Amino acid sequence: GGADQKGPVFLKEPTNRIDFSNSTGAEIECKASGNPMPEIIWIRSDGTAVGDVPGLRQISSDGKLVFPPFRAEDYRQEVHAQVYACLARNQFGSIISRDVHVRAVVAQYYEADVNKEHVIRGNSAVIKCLIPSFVADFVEVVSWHTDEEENYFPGAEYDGKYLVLPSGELHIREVGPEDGYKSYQCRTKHRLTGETRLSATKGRLVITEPVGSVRPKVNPQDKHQFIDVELASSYSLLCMAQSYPTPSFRWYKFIEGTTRKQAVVLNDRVKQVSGTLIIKDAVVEDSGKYLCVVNNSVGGESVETVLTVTAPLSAKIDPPTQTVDFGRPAVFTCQYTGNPIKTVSWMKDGKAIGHSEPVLRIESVKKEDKGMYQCFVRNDQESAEASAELKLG
Amino acid sequence: DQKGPVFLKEPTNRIDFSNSTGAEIECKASGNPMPEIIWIRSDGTAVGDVPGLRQISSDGKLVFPPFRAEDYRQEVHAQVYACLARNQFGSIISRDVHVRAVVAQYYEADVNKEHVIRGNSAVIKCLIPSFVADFVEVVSWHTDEEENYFPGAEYDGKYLVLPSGELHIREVGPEDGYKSYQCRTKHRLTGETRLSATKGRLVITEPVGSVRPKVNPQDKHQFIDVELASSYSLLCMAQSYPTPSFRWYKFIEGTTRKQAVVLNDRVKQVSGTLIIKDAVVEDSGKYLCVVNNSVGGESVETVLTVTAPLSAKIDPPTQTVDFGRPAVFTCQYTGNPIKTVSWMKDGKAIGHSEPVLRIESVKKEDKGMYQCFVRNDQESAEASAELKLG
Numbered sequence: 001g002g003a004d005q006k007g008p009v010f011l012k013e014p015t016n017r018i019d020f021s022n023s024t025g026a027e028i029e030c031k032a033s034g035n036p037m038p039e040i041i042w043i044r045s046d047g048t049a050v051g052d053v054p055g056l057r058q059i060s061s062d063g064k065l066v067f068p069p070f071r072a073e074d075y076r077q078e079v080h081a082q083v084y085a086c087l088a089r090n091q092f093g094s095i096i097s098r099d100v101h102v103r104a105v106v107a108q109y110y111e112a113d114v115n116k117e118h119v120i121r122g123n124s125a126v127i128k129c130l131i132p133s134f135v136a137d138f139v140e141v142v143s144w145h146t147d148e149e150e151n152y153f154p155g156a157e158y159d160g161k162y163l164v165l166p167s168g169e170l171h172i173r174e175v176g177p178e179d180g181y182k183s184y185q186c187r188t189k190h191r192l193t194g195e196t197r198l199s200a201t202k203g204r205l206v207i208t209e210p211v212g213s214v215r216p217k218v219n220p221q222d223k224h225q226f227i228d229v230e231l232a233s234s235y236s237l238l239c240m241a242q243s244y245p246t247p248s249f250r251w252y253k254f255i256e257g258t259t260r261k262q263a264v265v266l267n268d269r270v271k272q273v274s275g276t277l278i279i280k281d282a283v284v285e286d287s288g289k290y291l292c293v294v295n296n297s298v299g300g301e302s303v304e305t306v307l308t309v310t311a312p313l314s315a316k317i318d319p320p321t322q323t324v325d326f327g328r329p330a331v332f333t334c335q336y337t338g339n340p341i342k343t344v345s346w347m348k349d350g351k352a353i354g355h356s357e358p359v360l361r362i363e364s365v366k367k368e369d370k371g372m373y374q375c376f377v378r379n380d381q382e383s384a385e386a387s388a389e390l391k392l393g
Numbered sequence: 394d395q396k397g398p399v400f401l402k403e404p405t406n407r408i409d410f411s412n413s414t415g416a417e418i419e420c421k422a423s424g425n426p427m428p429e430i431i432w433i434r435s436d437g438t439a440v441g442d443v444p445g446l447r448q449i450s451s452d453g454k455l456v457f458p459p460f461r462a463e464d465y466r467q468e469v470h471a472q473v474y475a476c477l478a479r480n481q482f483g484s485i486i487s488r489d490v491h492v493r494a495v496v497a498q499y500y501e502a503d504v505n506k507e508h509v510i511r512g513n514s515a516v517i518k519c520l521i522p523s524f525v526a527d528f529v530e531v532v533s534w535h536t537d538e539e540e541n542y543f544p545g546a547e548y549d550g551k552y553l554v555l556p557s558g559e560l561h562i563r564e565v566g567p568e569d570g571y572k573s574y575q576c577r578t579k580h581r582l583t584g585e586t587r588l589s590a591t592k593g594r595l596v597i598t599e600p601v602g603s604v605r606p607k608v609n610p611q612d613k614h615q616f617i618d619v620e621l622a623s624s625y626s627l628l629c630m631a632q633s634y635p636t637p638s639f640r641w642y643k644f645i646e647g648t649t650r651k652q653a654v655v656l657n658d659r660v661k662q663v664s665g666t667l668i669i670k671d672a673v674v675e676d677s678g679k680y681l682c683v684v685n686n687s688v689g690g691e692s693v694e695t696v697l698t699v700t701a702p703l704s705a706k707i708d709p710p711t712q713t714v715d716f717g718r719p720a721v722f723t724c725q726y727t728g729n730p731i732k733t734v735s736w737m738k739d740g741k742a743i744g745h746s747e748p749v750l751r752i753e754s755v756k757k758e759d760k761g762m763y764q765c766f767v768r769n770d771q772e773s774a775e776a777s778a779e780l781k782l783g
């Protein structure tokens with residue numbers, strides 16, 4: 001061989017996740033350059049080569065791993081709920097792609113629902129579109145509809161009263177008896193198929209008119225929130241509480257690892273609506289534990305929220321290529337981004353090596369040490385990898 | 394023997410009553426000379442008579458007579474009072490007395506539809522309004538097939554009212570989706586019981602192939618509080634087909650290690666729910682419920698807090714110390730959780746948060762009555778001690 005040979009590099013790396021209906025099917029693609037041109041092989045989670053399954057899984061020699069449309073009775077967890085990867089190899093070495101979370105979704109009929117929202121006069125209301133759990137991963141709230149033929153969409157507040165939150169709930173401030181004169185139903189959309197649907201049931205506000213004074217009460221299921229949202233996405237933090245007189249809402253952010261907290265700063269990006277905090281754009285800096293203190297003249301209450309700002313994982317190794325003499329040490333530094341990072345690991349020609357350090361070190365180079373070196377970074381949801389070639393001389 | 398004031402009878406942390414009933418809180422202290430009883434507000438100022446709403450009597454009782462809804466005054470009817478005993482040797486203040494007069498008015502509970510997959514267990518909830526939630530609890534459940542489930546034993550090995558007041562139903566089938574469900578709730582200030590206006594119904598879902606256990610985001614983390622010696626239950630809300638298994642564990646405090654929960658006479662497991670007969674202090678901790686079927690798995694974790702009454706005692710009850718020498722007071726307490734432990738001297742804040750109060754070098758001024766206050770967000774307790782000079 002000699003030189004001029006280059007280790008494989010992914011021209012097009014498969015996606016981290018491909019969700020698709022059984023009625024659509026899917027295809028994931030892998031392309032790798034290099035000299036000589038490398039061989040593309042699809043492998044399962046356990047490292048073995050994937051076999052063709054007639055009608056369900058077919059290897060197309062274009063590099064594509066195809067999952068044809070199929071009927072519900074032909075659903076195979078081995079095929080359709082699996083993590084795949086692309087192995088690329090030539091005489092110089094071999095690399096493995098990031099995890100490819102393949103998830104086929106059998107289409108199912110479903111009905112969203114809306115229940116009666118009980119609220120004290122003057123307090124803000126939050127109407128939830130109840131989506132069945134077995135479609136919650138694909139069904140989102142597009143808009144809300146009223147029997148008065150009124151429609152509300154995500155964007156800006158209507159008449160300074162009605163606001164569709166980013167999280168899909170319909171926020172209504174200063175509720176009075178007259179607001180209970182209409183019923184609310186949500187319009188949901190399946191992101192795979194693309195169809196829209198009105199909830200099978202309507203929801204109305206049940207206004208109470210308390211006499212005397214009542215303290216801020218939060219439902220036990222609302223005292224602790226756990227929210228997830230990715231970069232550059234709009235989101236909202238609920239602080240649902242009821243009282244009379246109407247309560248005030250103050251947000252804080254804990255210092256990591258301590259009980260000490262600091263007041264949340266309001267601005268162009270971070271605005272507050274009653275007790276709901278609205279952020280136009282999420283930065284990883286936003287992550288942490290929040291506190292929402294609610295107050296009226298009789299008592300107080302609070303809501304804790306753990307916010308996690310996920311970010312796409314990326315990685316590259318320094319240097320991309322290095323030639324070191326025999327006996328001399330070889331160094332690989334893995335640089336990565338995204339959030340969170342739970343595990344770092346290394347690979348060499350498809351074989352797990354080293355440990356969880358960001359800097360891989362070879363003390364004394366041998367001829368067997370040459371080839372491709374990879375660095376994988378991972379969290380619960382996705383992964384990313386980077387390659388680097390080591391030559392001798 | 395001349396001694397400072399000590400509380401003989403102390404009002405309870407919480408005193409709820411209807412505007413039709415009224416209330417009469419009492420405070421009694423011992424000492425020689427006889428200490429005078431004085432009702433005060435948080436800022437230390439004495440509470441004054443409000444005609445027909447708040448009247449102090451010679452017996453030391455603070456009376457709240459029955460009143461009209463239009464006569465409700467927040468400053469009087471939703472206030473934290475305190476009893477102050479005092480004589481020449483010094484004064485002591487009682488634990489916080491949170492008075493709350495409640496205007497009786499109509500409320501109504503509701504029961505929504507529960508969507509459940511065939512074969513799985515269902516839990517029907519009696520939705521109680523917020524403005525009465527502190528006074529209204531589930532008494533029983535009712536069906537349109539003339540069935541009345543009460544808190545106690547399981548019915549036909551299928552229906553069971555949980556200590557939370559929810560109706561638990563194991564292995565639901567289309568047969569269970571024919572009947573309706575109503576809850577009876579009692580208001581503990583009026584003694585009235587009421588049927589819910591709405592009737593809950595089970596919508597059984599037929600399984601479209603296999604499905605992995607899914608848990609709703611609001612069910613992924615549970616935070617339950619329960620009083621010591623009282624009954625309670627821990628939910629594990631997961632839906633899957635075929636029906637999943639449930640395994641409970643308790644984490645070793647502050648570790649990732651966990652060990653299976655021992656089921657026994659006291660701790661029973663009904664499907665996914667963990668029923669406990671009576672709570673013990675050791676139950677407090679972080680639990681984990683693991684759910685599994687052929688398709689996949691899921692997990693729910695619960696933080697359980699066994700609340701217990703706060704009590705305090707100062708060691709020693711009395712001490713005589715010479716000038717120049719130190720005086721030490723040790724606040725020893727029980728109950729859970731303890732959020733703070735502060736001190737007072739003669740009804741005045743002193744020192745900071747610490748179980749031990751130290752006077753480095755006693756002077757004439759340092760003589761008097763010393764107190765320490767333990768309290769959490771729910772309740773408070775106090776203890777007193779006296780410092781004499783030598």
Ligand SMILES: *[C@@H]1O[C@H](CO)[C@@H](O[C@@H]2O[C@H](CO)[C@@H](O[C@@H]3O[C@H](CO)[C@@H](O)[C@H](O[C@H]4O[C@H](CO)[C@@H](O)[C@H](O)[C@@H]4O)[C@@H]3O)[C@H](O)[C@H]2NC(C)=O)[C@H](O)[C@H]1NC(C)=O
Pocket residue numbers: 293294295296299300301302733734735736742766768
């Ligand atoms: C809105 O309502 C909230 C209640 O949810 C209220 O915040 C609460 O304030 C109180 C008092 O500031 C906090 O309780 C304190 O917490 C600190 C830190 O733990 C303690 O050190 C304090 O100890 C005091 O108590 C001793 C007597 O037991 C005193 O002698 C001593 O000097 C201290 O004063 C005290 O326990 C409470 O923790 C917060 N609540 C939360 C959730 O943080 C807020 O002030 C209200 N705001 C408005 C505008 O209404």
Ligand SMILES: *[C@@H]1O[C@H](CO)[C@@H](O[C@@H]2O[C@H](CO)[C@@H](O[C@@H]3O[C@H](CO)[C@@H](O)[C@H](O[C@H]4O[C@H](CO)[C@@H](O)[C@H](O)[C@@H]4O)[C@@H]3O)[C@H](O)[C@H]2NC(C)=O)[C@H](O)[C@H]1NC(C)=O
Pocket residue numbers: 412413414459460461462496497498499
């Ligand atoms: C403690 O406070 C309570 C709460 O206010 C108080 O009981 C209520 O007093 C009112 C007096 O204003 C009672 O009478 C009401 O008066 C109107 C006429 O002014 C009646 O028409 C009312 O009847 C209504 O209620 C029916 C359902 O219950 C409706 O279907 C009907 O259409 C009427 O609108 C009502 O009788 C009122 O009944 C009581 N309510 C309760 C729950 O007790 C009480 O007197 C105070 N305690 C004292 C002063 O010791």
Ligand SMILES: *[C@@H]1O[C@H](CO)[C@@H](O[C@@H]2O[C@H](CO)[C@@H](O[C@@H]3O[C@H](CO)[C@@H](O)[C@H](O[C@H]4O[C@H](CO)[C@@H](O)[C@H](O)[C@@H]4O)[C@@H]3O)[C@H](O)[C@H]2NC(C)=O)[C@H](O)[C@H]1NC(C)=O
Pocket residue numbers: 099378379380381382383683684685689690691692
């Ligand atoms: C019954 O169900 C429980 C609950 O799910 C199940 O316990 C779980 O097992 C899974 C593995 O099947 C554990 O998840 C892994 O944990 C390791 C650390 O121990 C992680 O490193 C793993 O991360 C990988 O997976 C991700 C995709 O989810 C990838 O994106 C990532 O890059 C890694 O490759 C993985 O998260 C889980 O921790 C436990 N949980 C508990 C509470 O035990 C149990 O195995 C089931 N029982 C049976 C008999 O099947």
Ligand SMILES: *[C@@H]1O[C@H](CO)[C@@H](O[C@@H]2O[C@H](CO)[C@@H](O[C@@H]3O[C@H](CO[C@H]4O[C@H](CO)[C@@H](O)[C@H](O)[C@@H]4O)[C@@H](O)[C@H](O)[C@@H]3O)[C@H](O)[C@H]2NC(C)=O)[C@H](O)[C@H]1NC(C)=O
Pocket residue numbers: 022023024069070071072106107108109
């Ligand atoms: C992906 O999986 C999806 C879910 O299984 C598939 O969609 C489903 O497709 C079936 C058809 O295979 C639809 O069935 C409906 O059945 C009713 C009643 O069937 C009647 O017809 C026969 C003969 O006509 C009659 O003898 C019987 O007694 C019944 O009376 C029909 O009226 C409907 O038109 C429809 O055919 C499901 O409704 C449908 N579910 C969905 C879309 O959610 C999908 O086909 C799969 N994709 C692929 C590519 O196979």
